[PDB]
Symmetry: C4
Subunit: 348 residues, 4 copies
């Protein structure tokens, strides 16, 4: 048979829980490493964390808190153009903080982008389920032509070919992830995706050739997953579930069975779209102020970089090595054969 028929099952992919980072010679202290990342000359983050553009994760208060921590918030698009620009302006006016804003790849995308730019947004996230679509390429080209110095984050993709296409269209950051999200059912209902560590590595392999940073978006459930994503080639990670329970996320806290929870739902869930949904609606434990969660995340990254001998994220991306393991490896890696009696601040 011909080539495409015979190649159907050749590829294999890895997720975070399939690997560990191999410790390496180190003369760097975790407290000393640099976790700064340059997404563009006008978009420099002191910590490599972006909060997702989801209506249960990031509005103005979250974006302010993220920026004050050194990261970035993406204001979600499930609001009027006027309100989104208002939230962007609110963040800009809170000390000149960095802020991004999500825009769908639709006919009126440019109208929303116009108002966000008037509000001095620092980056637009052209967000779509399938970034390797001809419409997304076309929209990226159109935005780049109108706003030649605007930071354009485009996604989501999971292949080198898609990454190449968005870069050549004019995106200066590519967002990587099809289906790994904690609330995501795309892989179950449509059958489509790429295991996220392989997606990041494949997309970074291409993006590196152009000097373009990639965002590892989705499926990070512990701080070590972030370290693996950055070591696989991402400049920065995007989190939904691990931020949805913090005080500054939108949505109120509820008590269920005597415990505190916040609603967290996919943007393709029935509730968010108000259909054949590609996400579910759920709840996550309340975690208190964002600063505490960021401290645990960055602390785990600093530890991981110390173990890998990485003074900065460039060294980590370029040098860190992995070792593949089985599910037995994963069970050994977590706590095991002990009844845990207290919740740790970075493990529950």
């Amino acid at each position: 048979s011909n080539a495409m028929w015979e190649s159907k099952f050749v590829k294999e992919g890895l997720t975070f829980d399939d690997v560990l980072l191999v410790p390496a010679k180190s003369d760097v202290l975790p407290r000393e490493v640099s976790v700064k990342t340059v997404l563009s000359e006008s978009l420099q983050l002191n910590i490599p964390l972006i909060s997702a553009g989801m209506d249960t994760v990031t509005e103005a208060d979250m974006a302010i808190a993220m920026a004050r921590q050194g990261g970035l918030g993406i204001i979600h698009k499930n609001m009027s153009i006027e309100q989104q620009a208002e939230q962007v302006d609110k963040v800009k006016r809170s000390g000149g903080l960095l802020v991004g804003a999500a825009v769908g790849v639709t006919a009126d995308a440019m109208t929303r982008i116009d108002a966000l730019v008037k509000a001095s947004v620092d980056a637009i996230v052209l967000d779509t389920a399938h970034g390797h679509s001809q419409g997304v390429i076309d929209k990226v080209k159109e935005v780049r032509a109108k706003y030649p110095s605007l930071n354009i984050i485009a996604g989501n993709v999971a292949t080198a070919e898609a990454t190449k296409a968005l870069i050549e269209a004019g995106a200066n950051v590519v967002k990587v992830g099809i289906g790994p999200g904690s609330i995501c059912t795309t892989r179950v209902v449509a059958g489509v995706g790429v295991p996220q560590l392989t997606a990041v590595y494949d997309c970074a392999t291409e993006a590196r050739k152009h000097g373009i940073p990639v965002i590892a978006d989705g499926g990070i459930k512990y701080s070590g997953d972030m370290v693996k994503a950055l070591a696989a080639g991402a400049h920065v990670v995007m989190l939904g579930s691990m931020f949805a329970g913090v005080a500054e996320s939108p949505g109120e806290t509820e008590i269920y069975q005597g415990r505190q929870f916040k609603v967290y739902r996919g943007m393709g869930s029935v509730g968010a779209m108000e259909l054949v949904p590609e996400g579910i609606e759920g709840r996550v434990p309340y975690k208190g102020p964002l600063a505490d969660t960021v401290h645990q995340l960055v602390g785990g990254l600093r530890a991981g970089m110390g173990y890998c001998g990485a003074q900065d994220l460039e060294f980590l991306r370029e040098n860190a090595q992995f070792i593949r393991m089985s599910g037995a490896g994963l069970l050994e890696s977590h706590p095991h054969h002990v009844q845990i009696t207290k919740e740790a601040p970075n493990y529950s």
Copy 2:
């Protein structure tokens, strides 16, 4: 040692949960794709769905509802010849809808087929546990000789060699699946089967040479599984469990623990055969009208084809690529690390 001794463990097989479809360049919208499939010039389905010929899945009301949705129902064989022909006639008389009917590979198969043909059945399913048996080949040849223009669906098989044999015997559709069914214990009690995605791919590899469509029968538990089966080479899928809970299936709805359920059982279960059974008896949640389940199934397929750049199912079969993953990949692919609070229409 000789060749058959040394080859015993060489082969490896994949199931739906071992793979994901890789997203590809796309300029097609899910709502625009064609999901039409031609099983023969006289058996064209607007959607690639067949309801199984099981006594808890398909009688006349189910077959009418399936046909009105653009698919096909197989009237089960656990009834007299007279009653089966009556149900076939009932469907034909409900607007000229397409209908199929199951027939066992037994001495009196031709007598039942005669009455079904008199009733203008559109296709006979020569259904047997092991389609690669000399008796099935012989029966297919005999039916083809008597009814040269009758659509003959023959199965079940799981190998290229068996597919070749049924095609050369005169079947114009081959039904693929040994043991993946949700209610099936063939693999546990007899030890025999082939992981279903590999079975579909191997059988389609052979059937493609002859221009013969294959049905992926069994083991589909989410809409994404159907997309994978079609991308592995099947023209159409056959579902039991995902249809057994709909209003139009036979059998009444029961309340258990305050929830609504319908009985669903293997045709080789003790109850259905009334023995050494190869199926079990169980229950599945009630799902309401068939149309709602079909809408979710076809919607997931449309999404998957959009992600794969497939304007029609021919493109999907011929071009779609997979990536293999571990159980960690599967857990990332489902929702994870969130308490789900609402049932989604396509995920429970």
Copy 3:
């Protein structure tokens, strides 16, 4: 480094749940296949089943029932020489039924063997934890010299080298299995074993060269596992757990939580040895008369042989092919995504 250091992790092994048997062209009916097996010219079994020589599995009543079903019982050794010979004689006097008896590889083994031979035992099982020990080889040679026509079953082993050694010592049947038993902790507490399907295949590969049959002993939990063991090269299987709950096993039935159970324990458990044990003590559901369990076991074997085109067990051993699968393959192979409402006679 040298060769033994570098080869430490090269080998890989398969268990029953790692594979399926591939269906093949068949013109044989399950009810027509032969499941007869010749362990020696004086030890011919109409069904390929031996009940384990364990003190919760086989005494005289079990051995009588097994022989009447066409199989073989091994009278366990946890009794005086006088009592064991008495139980052997009881079986012989119940219609000339076949019977075996277990003997440990100890200084006084020959004394026990002498009384069992006087009682017309048909086969001695020289049973030990580690059959590849110099003492076992020596004892096999000694018994063969004294009793040149006695059927000697020797074990347990899991390698071709050990199989070769026991055959050359004079065993005419080799018993295969280190650690797969349902009640066995050898692999957990000593770290030692070979996944049982690979153990059977490796040992049969060697034994075939000499014309010597092997017994697949341990780890069979469904009838399909027996089919896989025989297809991997074993002439016959030995079962403990699947026989321990039948009426004819020794030990009384107990009610726990309103359900009927029988005690089943490893012969290396604290209770059986009355220490550092290599087995545990447990309970299994009561199953009623042996005949019902044997009917389900042989029925599953007949189905499996029909699927494989095997008119007899020689054809199965010599021709049957496997396909390797993942844990996802295993979950597809069992019933899934259905609430089971009734216990099947061959699946619980």
Copy 4:
């Protein structure tokens, strides 16, 4: 791309639960094998067991009990220099028993070492999270220069390169393990580690070239795991969880749900450090006197060595072979398909 980018995912690693030891020709009895191990000419252990230097595992009473059993206790460092030296002296004065003591790689390490040496400690454990750090190498060199005949145990490492570096710095025992510990979250929160059997094998491969013994530290949950670690190349193992519940460990016994438990926590847990912790706090069942647990551990090792034909641990390290298995292999290896009714002394 360049070499380090392309090698990121090449390596694969094994844990204890990924393998079994293959039985081999044996003429040795478990009760006859030697389990003595020479860590240095002045540090000879009659059994290959060290209790971890953790504040819920080893103080003076544990170290006395370990030494009387033929092993070694490491007095933990979570106490003043004066108190640690006092506990070392207490052990030395209980019959000249061997004792070790943990020291962090800090500026004042030498001051603590000075007091421990004045107290006649037999070995210092230079304990750190990441032994492949330039500071650890430097500290090992400094201690070796001041105390040329002191036994220096240095760790923890997981690579041949790190092992080489610590040996060349002057450590005469290397401690191996990054993240396998039962209470450890390093792999989850920092993303870093090596599956422990591969870590031991890789480190032993290097250490063998220099004649240097390695300690397999962490992740042993059954006695068979210890046998695998020693067969992979370690001279001795270090246990935390399997010793934390014994009478002689520090910390009092608590009743929870009518059962007896002792606290067991990581030394990098919030509680032990009193932060971004790399361990959790939990509890383990109370096990009674240390001697009973040691008897079960050494008994399992003796059984494993008998199965492998190893008269002593040198033979085991140099000759024992493994076979790799799936998770299905693991489930077959444990007890299965039986309800366990009594706790075994070596299996719960």
